[PDB]
Design a protein around this ligand. Sequence first.
Ligand SMILES: Nc1nc2c(ncn2[C@@H]2O[C@@H]3COP(=O)(O)O[C@H]3[C@H]2O)c(=O)[nH]1
Ligand SMILES: Nc1nc2c(ncn2[C@@H]2O[C@@H]3COP(=O)(O)O[C@H]3[C@H]2O)c(=O)[nH]1
Ligand SMILES: Nc1nc2c(ncn2[C@@H]2O[C@@H]3COP(=O)(O)O[C@H]3[C@H]2O)c(=O)[nH]1
Ligand SMILES: Nc1nc2c(ncn2[C@@H]2O[C@@H]3COP(=O)(O)O[C@H]3[C@H]2O)c(=O)[nH]1
Ligand SMILES: Nc1nc2c(ncn2[C@@H]2O[C@@H]3COP(=O)(O)O[C@H]3[C@H]2O)c(=O)[nH]1
Ligand SMILES: Nc1nc2c(ncn2[C@@H]2O[C@@H]3COP(=O)(O)O[C@H]3[C@H]2O)c(=O)[nH]1
Ligand SMILES: Nc1nc2c(ncn2[C@@H]2O[C@@H]3COP(=O)(O)O[C@H]3[C@H]2O)c(=O)[nH]1
Ligand SMILES: Nc1nc2c(ncn2[C@@H]2O[C@@H]3COP(=O)(O)O[C@H]3[C@H]2O)c(=O)[nH]1
Lengths: 193, 193, 193, 193
Amino acid sequence: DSSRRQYQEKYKQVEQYMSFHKLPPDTRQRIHDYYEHRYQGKMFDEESILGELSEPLREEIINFNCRKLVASMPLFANADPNFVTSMLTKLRFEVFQPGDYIIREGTIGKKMYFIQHGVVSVLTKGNKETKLADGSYFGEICLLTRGRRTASVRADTYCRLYSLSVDNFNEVLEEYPMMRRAFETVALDRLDR
Amino acid sequence: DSSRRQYQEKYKQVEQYMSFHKLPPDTRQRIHDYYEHRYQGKMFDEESILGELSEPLREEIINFNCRKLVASMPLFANADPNFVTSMLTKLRFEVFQPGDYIIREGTIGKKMYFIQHGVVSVLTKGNKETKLADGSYFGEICLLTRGRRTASVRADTYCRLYSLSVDNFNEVLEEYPMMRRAFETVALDRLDR
Amino acid sequence: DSSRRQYQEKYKQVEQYMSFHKLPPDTRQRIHDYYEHRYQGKMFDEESILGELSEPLREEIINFNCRKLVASMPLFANADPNFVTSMLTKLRFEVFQPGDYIIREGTIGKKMYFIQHGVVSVLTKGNKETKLADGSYFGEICLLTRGRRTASVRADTYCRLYSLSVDNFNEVLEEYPMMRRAFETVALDRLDR
Amino acid sequence: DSSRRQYQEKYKQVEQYMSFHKLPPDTRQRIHDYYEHRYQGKMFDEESILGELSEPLREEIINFNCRKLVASMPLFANADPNFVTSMLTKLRFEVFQPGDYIIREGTIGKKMYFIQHGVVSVLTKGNKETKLADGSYFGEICLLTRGRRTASVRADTYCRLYSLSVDNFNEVLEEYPMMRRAFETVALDRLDR
Ligand SMILES: Nc1nc2c(ncn2[C@@H]2O[C@@H]3COP(=O)(O)O[C@H]3[C@H]2O)c(=O)[nH]1
Ligand SMILES: Nc1nc2c(ncn2[C@@H]2O[C@@H]3COP(=O)(O)O[C@H]3[C@H]2O)c(=O)[nH]1
Ligand SMILES: Nc1nc2c(ncn2[C@@H]2O[C@@H]3COP(=O)(O)O[C@H]3[C@H]2O)c(=O)[nH]1
Ligand SMILES: Nc1nc2c(ncn2[C@@H]2O[C@@H]3COP(=O)(O)O[C@H]3[C@H]2O)c(=O)[nH]1
Ligand SMILES: Nc1nc2c(ncn2[C@@H]2O[C@@H]3COP(=O)(O)O[C@H]3[C@H]2O)c(=O)[nH]1
Ligand SMILES: Nc1nc2c(ncn2[C@@H]2O[C@@H]3COP(=O)(O)O[C@H]3[C@H]2O)c(=O)[nH]1
Ligand SMILES: Nc1nc2c(ncn2[C@@H]2O[C@@H]3COP(=O)(O)O[C@H]3[C@H]2O)c(=O)[nH]1
Ligand SMILES: Nc1nc2c(ncn2[C@@H]2O[C@@H]3COP(=O)(O)O[C@H]3[C@H]2O)c(=O)[nH]1
């Protein structure tokens, strides 16, 4: 753990930031708890390690680290393993906090999200909200037809998510375009209900 | 206060540069004062801190940091908080010196500006000068017309500004179509006199 | 050698990485081995240095550095000195392990490959496997017709390769268009066989 | 100045690179010498200093820094001074050596060059050499006709050049369409002689 050092070195930097801007005690509570959930004691340049290795090693390594997330992922557990690997290599780990608006209706959407751990409300205007939890995913609609978000999605609890940007989503469905209808169908169901 | 030391250390290399170049006394006094006024003893990797946090937190922090600018701005007076946040996250801090031309008539423009603090004169070939100060904005005409600057704008005092690029303007206005009218109105009234 | 130390220090970071993710013994051995072949005890910023020099110097160097690769290389010998220089400057060094799939049939190809040192099996579906080594190249067919990979290519031994992106490939034949044919020629004997 | 430090540190790193790849004594001499001419014992990060100041300061600094260059150029003689500034802020300093081909005929050009100090020979397949020096420029033809290099341009002496990319070139001219014609004039003159 020299990555224990970094966490502290970098959190010291954030306390001087909060100081300098005199953020209210609540806000500092949030920043601090987030930072704890997100880095969980440690900071490292994961991407620059993987950057140093071959593509196959990256793929092996990523598959190991994510075999749990995958088995617990309806859409991956079931799919061609190569599609899975390619999706996995493009996933960015993200944390959100109770009450956070992950997607705001009307926005232009740049990411879509996968639920590793957490619960989330999907709020459309005029109707009862619905929920999504571990295993599900949202935000694919705007990725399919560039466009304004169709619903707001608010974290109901701490959420550990993996995002996928619009470019990477496109890159992947270019690689595995047989997999686009699978997202289209889901978009479609969601849009009529 | 490593921020304090970073500021003495960075101004040292600026002291280096000025020397290796024989910068006239006048110039080097403008640079030093600029430096003092813009960094004010403190030099830190703020964007690097902000980048370690979630979007929701960047929003909460920015909204707090800027609550006084927002308060001083007729444009945000009665508006959707999300529109406001959206605007804030795309503004960039700038500082100009007495005498500086922030905008020249007849030029291609891709930036507008929101005055946080200071006083600016608006010059038009053939007319009386007017002035603008805390809370106002300028350079929206060009962003609307996509043509050229219809007037020059010169700082009368040290100005603390927040610029906003045309791409950013249009994106925000895409998400918040109703706010396009606010800018047209102010532009037109400005042009009707 | 100061950049012996680099290798030695960065690898310790690779060590913390494998520990943190509890990677299988076989995976760790594989990484240890890859990192050993790829860097040979020595890590330093190449890009950063060639970056500091003029283009003509960069070219004087790459030509010298790679004369033995060029010698080994049939397509180069009878080609323009300038074509050879322009290709070298776009080549990226990449290492594969025994067993690694370099190219997988059916994938979208964005790269082709020249073999400094390696042996590689070429496996077309339901018919006789073939090999390629030092001097040879593969992955050309795809960059030629912007379609899918017509064979898989697996690495028999450690493979020291120089890759070349589609954009880059395109760039160069658009400059020396005489030279496209050479690839087309080697592509077509391969397709009909 | 730790920029005398940087220089040594960065130059020590070139040496290790040179030893490592075992470059013939002549190649080493040219590297060594380029480096001395290009950096002249000092290494700092210009771009990041100017990067910490306002646009009007950059413009004042540059206009000073380049008054001889400007003085030296017929082009800039009776030019709208805001156009000179616009050109100036987009020039990148470059060094070349006796014998360097700055431009090879037939290549696809993406830059043009303004001679600060140096003599260059201009070679046309068939015709006789001519020479350009302090205060002249070359490379514009390709920029005006997004096409091939109509001539080679080799350096007779050490040259201190300022290059302008086609993007910046097309931007300055978008801003100043009048000026595209000063360039066409010379281009045509040079083509028809
Ligand atoms: N703790 C931590 N995780 C990171 C960092 N950068 C990327 N990650 C990844 O985010 C993942 C979150 O879940 P894990 O604890 O499995 O492993 C983590 C890493 O693979 C970092 O700086 N700290
Ligand atoms: N419109 C809509 N979106 C839903 C529903 N249930 C889940 N979602 C997700 O909420 C997301 C909000 O942003 P997108 O429009 O990008 O994609 C939407 C869907 O992925 C639903 O019933 N209607
Ligand atoms: N003083 C200072 N401010 C910075 C720096 N980098 C970014 N900033 C931001 O610029 C802002 C200027 O206005 P504030 O004083 O409100 O807060 C400042 C910071 O939010 C820096 O290096 N020094
Ligand atoms: N033309 C004009 N512009 C004004 C006036 N008062 C303020 N401005 C601002 O000055 C700006 C000059 O740049 P723009 O034409 O982009 O946008 C203009 C307006 O935002 C005015 O009375 N006339
Ligand atoms: N050791 C090392 N070599 C590199 C790197 N990037 C590019 N290279 C080059 O790739 C070359 C492969 O063969 P060599 O080991 O002879 O020399 C190597 C370097 O010139 C790097 O990060 N480390
Ligand atoms: N189709 C085919 N490709 C071959 C053969 N031998 C080598 N290759 C190479 O294998 C590569 C696989 O990827 P590509 O189809 O792009 O390009 C192919 C060729 O360069 C062969 O017998 N048939
Ligand atoms: N010494 C040095 N000069 C640089 C560097 N980057 C840009 N330059 C500029 O290159 C210019 C060459 O001519 P001058 O010596 O007048 O001024 C020099 C600097 O402004 C660098 O890294 N080191
Ligand atoms: N064709 C031509 N080019 C010249 C002559 N004198 C100078 N040049 C420069 O040489 C340059 C080579 O690159 P370009 O063709 O882009 O632009 C050309 C001119 O700017 C000349 O007499 N004929």
